[PDB]
Amino acid sequence: MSVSNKLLAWSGVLEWQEKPKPASVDANTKLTRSLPCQVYVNHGENLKTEQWPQKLIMQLIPQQLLTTLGPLFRNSRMVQFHFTNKDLESLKGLYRIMGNGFAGCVHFPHTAPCEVRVLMLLYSSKKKIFMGLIPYDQSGFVNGIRQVITNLEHHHHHH
Numbered sequence: 001m002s003v004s005n006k007l008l009a010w011s012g013v014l015e016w017q018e019k020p021k022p023a024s025v026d027a028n029t030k031l032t033r034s035l036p037c038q039v040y041v042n043h044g045e046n047l048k049t050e051q052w053p054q055k056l057i058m059q060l061i062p063q064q065l066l067t068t069l070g071p072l073f074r075n076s077r078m079v080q081f082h083f084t085n086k087d088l089e090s091l092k093g094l095y096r097i098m099g100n101g102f103a104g105c106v107h108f109p110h111t112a113p114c115e116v117r118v119l120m121l122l123y124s125s126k127k128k129i130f131m132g133l134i135p136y137d138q139s140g141f142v143n144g145i146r147q148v149i150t151n152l153e154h155h156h157h158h159h
Contacts, residue, residue, distance in 0.1 A: 006040035006080050010049035012056065013037070016094070016104060019158045020059045020149060035083060035090055042078030042131075053111055058104040058121060065148045066103050066120070072140060073120070073133050081121060081130030098123035098130070105145050106132070119141055 015034045021028040034055070041047070083091055098104065104121035118141045119134035135141045 004041050009041040010039040010052055012054045014056050014058050016058045016060065018060060022098065023154050036086055037081050037083045041081040042080060043150065045077035047077060055108045056106050056108055058106040060097055060102040061105050061148045061152055062152065063101040063103040065151065069141065069144045074136055076133035076135045079119065079132045079134060099125055
């Protein structure tokens with residue numbers, strides 16, 4: 001009833017890494033930060049969110065290289081992220097990053113037989129909200145993201 005634009009599907013915490021590479025010589029692999037969110041799905045997509053872990057792993061990767069995965073987004077489920085503003089400072093910092101053309105690739109922890117599926121988080125300033133599509137095939141999407149991550153690490157413009 002009424003709710004037809006976006007359906008509330010999940011509410012959980014996301015943990016984001018600024019800098020992802022577990023280098024082995026780097027045993028303490030960077031700082032991960034958590035932020036609570038409410039996740040809606042954009043219509044047509046029937047999935048069960050109780051099957052989702054309460055933390056999802058997201059890495060900020062450049063949206064510029066994500067363009068290469070463009071046609072793969074045509075087979076995905078839509079989501080929208082609205083954050084539970086506990087820490088506006090954390091949001092503000094994240095706004096800078098995701099608004100600068102960083103995308104949050106969300107990987108789901110293992111619970112489903114393979115690796116679930118994978119999700120992309122994009123900030124839309126126009127809607128002032130976060131949007132994203134989740135591709136079913138983790139293999140192709142993660143493969144593309146692996147390229148982005150390995151390139152990003154090779155580049156390393158992080159501080």
